[PDB]
Paper text:
[name], a new Ralstonia solanacearum phage, is a short-tailed phage. The [name] head contains 540 copies of [name] (MCP) [name] and 540 copies of cement protein (CP) [name] arranged in an icosahedral shell with a triangulation number T = 9. The structures of [name] and [name] show a canonical HK97-like fold and an Ig-like fold, respectively.
Finally, we obtained a 3.7 Å resolution density map of the [name] head that allowed us to build the full atomic models of the MCPs and CPs in the asymmetric unit of the icosahedron. Therefore, the asymmetric unit of the icosahedron contains 9 monomers of [name], which include one E-hexon, one-third C-hexon, and one-fifth penton and the 9 monomers of [name]. According to the gp5 domain nomenclature in HK97, each [name] monomer can be divided into four domains: an especially extended N-arm domain (residues 2–47), a long β-hairpin E-loop domain (residues 48–91), a P-domain (residues 92–140 and 307–342) containing two α-helices and a three-stranded β-sheet, and a highly complex A-domain (residues 141–307 and 343–367) including the long C-arm (residues 348–367). The superposition of the nine monomers (named A-I) of [name] in the asymmetric unit of the head shows significant conformational changes in the N-arms and E-loops resulting in large-scale swinging. The helix α5 (residues 245–255) of monomer A (from penton) adopts a drastically different conformation to the other eight monomers, which results in a greater curvature in the central conformations of the pentons than in the hexons. Accompanying the movements of the α5 helices, the five bulky sidechains (Trp245) in the penton point to the central pore and form a hydrophobic core.
Residue numbers in the entry:
A (entry chain O), B (entry chain P), C (entry chain Q): 2 to 156
D (entry chain H): 54 to 369
E (entry chain I): 212 to 369
F (entry chain I): 107 to 159
G (entry chain F): 318 to 369
H (entry chain I): 2 to 53
Write the structure that this text describes.
Amino acid sequence: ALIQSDFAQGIRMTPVPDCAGDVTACRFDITLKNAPAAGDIIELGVLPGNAVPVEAILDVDDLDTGGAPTITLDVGIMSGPVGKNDPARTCGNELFAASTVGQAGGVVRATASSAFRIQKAEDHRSVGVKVAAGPATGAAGKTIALILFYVQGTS
Amino acid sequence: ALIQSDFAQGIRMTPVPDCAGDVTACRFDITLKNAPAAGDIIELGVLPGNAVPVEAILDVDDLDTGGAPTITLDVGIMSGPVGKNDPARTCGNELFAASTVGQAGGVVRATASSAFRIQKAEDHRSVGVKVAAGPATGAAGKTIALILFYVQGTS
Amino acid sequence: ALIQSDFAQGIRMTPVPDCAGDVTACRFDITLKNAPAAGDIIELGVLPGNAVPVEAILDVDDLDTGGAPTITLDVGIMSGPVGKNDPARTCGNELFAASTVGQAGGVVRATASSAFRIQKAEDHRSVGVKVAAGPATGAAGKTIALILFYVQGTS
Amino acid sequence: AGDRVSFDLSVRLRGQPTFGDDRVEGKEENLKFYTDEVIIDQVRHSVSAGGRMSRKRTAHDLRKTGRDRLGDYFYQLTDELFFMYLSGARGINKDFILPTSFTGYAKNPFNTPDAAHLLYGGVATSKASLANTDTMSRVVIERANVQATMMQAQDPETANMVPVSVEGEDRYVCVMSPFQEHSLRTSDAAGWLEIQKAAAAAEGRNNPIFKGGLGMIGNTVLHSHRNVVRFSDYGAGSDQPAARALFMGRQAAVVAYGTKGGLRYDWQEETKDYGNEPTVASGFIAGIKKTRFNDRDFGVISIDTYAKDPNPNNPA
Amino acid sequence: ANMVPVSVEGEDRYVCVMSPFQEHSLRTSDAAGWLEIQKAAAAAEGRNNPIFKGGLGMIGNTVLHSHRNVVRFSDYGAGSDQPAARALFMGRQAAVVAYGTKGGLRYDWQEETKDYGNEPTVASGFIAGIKKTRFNDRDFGVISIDTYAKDPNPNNPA
Amino acid sequence: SRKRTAHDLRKTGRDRLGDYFYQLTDELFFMYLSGARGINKDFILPTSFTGYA
Amino acid sequence: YDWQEETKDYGNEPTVASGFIAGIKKTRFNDRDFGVISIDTYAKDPNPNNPA
Amino acid sequence: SSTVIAFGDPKAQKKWSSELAVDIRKKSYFESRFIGTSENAVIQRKTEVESD
């Protein structure tokens, strides 16, 4: 099911640039209550109206540990509204196709070419982490942190 | 364990000298309704603010009954507030370095060179006994009581 | 030599009890400069006019650092007025005769019966210390201090 | 000018009097004082009646709605801040504006009530011993009254809690989470139903069972309000709901408004992007602390009963 | 000597004093009959009964009160651990006091300056004596009701 | 020690003595009418007490 | 100056005592003196006969 | 950058409030009602030594 962070529900506001092509960042993070599982869609943060990502930094804290880890994250842009609790919303592999981070604690940066080719849409959209493969053992309380750079006036 | 005892609290009062050089003494006594352990802080009495010990007499009953006694009592100023009950407060060895009075009931007066060189302080410091050696086999409801003479208006 | 303390010069103060019987004490101390020598007289302090010693406490540092130390302090009442700088002023052996303190740190109290039998006189007699025997070898900044208890309305 | 306020408490005397003809010119009291600090800070928010086109594809003007929403938002924010400090912690309360990871306002941190001012429901001794029988009941608020009376007779260092001029005169106010009121007025073990059924036998239709909320119990005016902190980690193995009823009396908490004549909402107006997205932002300058003289708080007893969602159909 | 009611409340009623632990034991238990009678009285008069609006009413013809400073013992019981209290039951000359100063209690305020005007001192005291009247070897006017009063809030450090 | 504080200590001292003697006389009454000093704190007089005249 | 007179020993010794309430410090901002330069010259008393 | 007076900086002024919070006296029970000079009083007072 959808696990919402504070940014999606509207509790924690998200920044928008007040200038054309002014790089803006916010620490889209969530603290994971219970353990992650296959098919989990984590709605991390909302990408603002006309902005497009220009660099995304993903950092996670050793989600599954265990041994022979098999976890693999997959973040993207969801088609649904800003914060609706509809379990039919899907996550595409735009930014990170297969992060393979969280197998061991570390930081990965956007590498797939599709990361910088996202098109603008006049409505807000929610960036969502989808755990593609189930994690070995797993852990509870480990946080998912996405750092997103977007510019609000690209052509 | 910090053992509060009447004088340290606001229950029993210690008298201020008044005038300058007027030798003033009060008997700070405790009825130890417990057995001293290897490490204790026994807050006997309150050295009133801005006064220096001139002569110190330690009156103590028999604390150890087993053969070859090894109890040592260290009487010194313990820094902090007047009667705040915390285990962080720690005393030193100023009025007494390492007393043999614990082996058998007796009285030994201040004989340390540094006993008479205590400096002033604008607040109510407290005098505390630390048992710096093993109680050995013994102890019961007994009494330790020092009689320190303090004078105000010293220079 | 007549190495006089602050009390003799009047720079510091000596206390006087208001009522008859109040034991009063002041710490007569000097941080003597140079070295103790045979025959020098240290004028530590002055007991007030109507006053007799009630208990004398003498504490010193190590006034000689050598092999077979042999320093012997003698303290007593002096003859001339408090401030007059005359080498023709002699002490006695009333409060302490051959006190043999100074080879170690130590603290000594009145032992001779003449310490407590001092007779009163209307004028400010001066208590002085004379190093009787040799200073053995070497002492630079070590301090000598004498604490007197005196009552004013004796009979 | 100054970002802190210090106020003083003068505790009573605790020295033994000297009987007989023994002289007492020497042995004298030392009056003891206690202090606490309230640190001010600035809290502002911004609403964005944005877009030049977005203000034309809508019939309603958006600036006035934004202003009204900001007013309401500051209303509820100050109210929930009051209940958050008087309770000492943030739980899982979801309607609260502030995020679930909240720790302070202006470095005047959250202070958990001591063992003396923390009253559990039923029979319990710690936050890890609540069960289904530790629901809030008439017995519990009577225990709260007994604590408010003989708090000194057990701890010789605290200070007496004294009543507030509520309704008529001199009654302790006991705010209640609206799940605890349901636990009272919808259970026979809570003990409220029997006495209020007797009262109904006295007064026909004006009894609190039919025509209102809870009534006074032992001169303790009970009120219920949404903004009462509600925890979710209590229990022997966690995952058991809880609450914190507030038993208030006189100087429970201190407010230091940082602007003249009480709090003043000053609205600031700025426009972005060559005249698009007009934005309104305002904010008060204030700081709130729960009075904590010595290490024992001064005005509130935090009844910490167990209160479960009555209707389980709610989304978690 | 038989007790006599005192006229300090109403007319000729024994005055009984309680430690609020015992007050709680009455007010929050079904075994201390006060709850049943006061529920009936509330049925006779609602929102004015002592259940809702304060302390205890009369049980029998004895006005019941509660005050913090009622002696509480902590050694009663077979194991010397059960807490207990000692509720009074007073009437007529329970105890007498000899004030010995003048009509009424007169504190004697005195002010003394310790040192040249530094440290002003305020000292006062009364000269009076108290005793519970004991004729022969038996009390005269007090019945020490001595019950078991546990701390209803076990969180108190005690 | 009274210039380091805006609250005059003489008037507070007098008021504290007033309330302290009020409390002490009531406590003494309850001590004598009950016949024993219990283990009750909040009492000025100590735990081990036996009369005062 | 607050003159205060107190008599001791049944009025035998009348005493006078007074004292101001003041404190003095040289302005020390950071660790450097604000307005004083101390000059440590050699001051030998000219006359030898002067005692000590 | 930008000036921040920050917290705990000796420039940060603090205002002390003059109002005193007082731990009020416990309400006494044995008030003037009970103590009386007549026979009908829980606490009798004996004036046989108030003036003698």
